[PDB]
């Protein structure tokens, strides 16, 4: 149901632009349930993340590599599913999936439930990954 | 040469190593020098005994380099720029030594993580270590 494996197959986002408008670099950490480094996500998600400002809510962009293996990728804000959408995709050998989602003001950490699968083998689930920004996010309408 | 499947296995395998990367790096070196004594020529003024402070220290620096290579696997040559100049231009290390190091590293990973070290992951790690060896042994 809307996995990154199948989402990136849309040729409309073969190399679509996604760097227009105001943004700020924001560092973060990807931790597991024990507040220790979630390594697979640490290698996969680019740090720092770009946070694009809008009129309503700030939209954080996450650069996910090896998208062809990434199956499930759900982001939650205070145990509420955020609307994630694929904005652009770099083809192989780069294989980077750029996805965006809105975050309310003051939100410093998010919950990431995700999974990976190679072609059609063992589905490796990652039940809890904890994305924690170095500072809380705040949208700026004045830019 | 490195497929999406290979890159996935490298992250997962090196991820499950995680905190013990520096320990296996040091172990791989001690396993290399004892097995292949010709490798010692590149480290003349070094303490190459069992449980040496220099070997443990150097093993951490190798593990951190591998972790850096795994994190930036999509752009290794740019990630390992300084190390390529160091090994290729300055030190002029023979590429054969890298095959001996990776041989010892894969054996170490197999010992400490037997169930996780599947033939598919074993293939990807060797393929990953080969590509990192070509970057370091090549001149730019
Ligand atoms: C897995 C592949 C390898 C990696 C990732 C790697 C990484 C590194 C790094 C990060 C350093 C810098 C240490 C420092 O700052 O002091 C270094 C130094 C060095 N490496 Fe390697 N290396 C690899 C393979 C080899 C091989 C095969 C040899 C030859 C047997 C070799 C010989 C040396 C020497 C002689 C130094 C300088 C030692 C010093 O004076 O500090 N390396 N290596």
From Swiss-Prot, chain A:
Residues 19-143 form the NEAT domain. This is Iron-regulated surface determinant protein H. It is found in: Secreted, Cell wall. Binds human plasma haptoglobin-hemoglobin complexes, haptoglobin and hemoglobin. Binds haptoglobin-hemoglobin complexes with significantly higher affinity than haptoglobin alone. The NEAT 1 domain binds with higher affinity than the NEAT 2 domain haptoglobin-hemoglobin complexes, haptoglobin and hemoglobin. More than one IsdH NEAT 1 domain interacts with a single hemoglobin. Belongs to the IsdH family. It comes from Staphylococcus aureus (strain MSSA476). The gene is isdH.
Curated annotation (Swiss-Prot), chain B:
Changing residue 130 to D: In Yuda; O(2) affinity down. O2 binds at residue 58. The record marks 11, 56, 60, 90, 99 as: Not glycated. Changing residue 45 to R: In Fort de France; O(2) affinity up. The modification Phosphotyrosine is found at residue 24. Changing residue 120 to E: In J-Meerut/J-Birmingham. GO terms for molecular function: heme binding; iron ion binding; oxygen binding; oxygen carrier activity. Pfam families: Globin. This is Hemoglobin subunit alpha. It comes from Homo sapiens. The lineage of its organism: Eukaryota, Metazoa, Chordata, Craniata, Vertebrata. The gene is HBA1.
